[PDB]
Amino acid sequence: LNLGTGQYRFPVVGNAKFNTVYILSDETTPLNIIGCGWEGNYLRRSSGI
Amino acid sequence: LNLGTGQYRFPVVGNAKFNTVYILSDETTPLNIIGCGWEGNYLRRSSGI
Q: Which cellular compartments is it found in (chains A, B)?
């Protein structure tokens, strides 16, 4: 088998309101997804509360 | 149809105690309102508590 263990990093570049990450595959093969992270620049100008 | 998805930003300029935002329309057409935000300068001189 070709199975492997995480993680896997991949660029999701752009605004948060517009990027829709999704996982289609197919297959004759399993998968497991444990967690999901993200990073990114955050800048709110109006310092709230 | 002409439906669309948010957001929509629009100036509510002035003091908070005096601005009354409200939504009349009419129509033969639906609407949905999910959330509402606002920003604005806040300056309380007397640093309370």
A: Virion
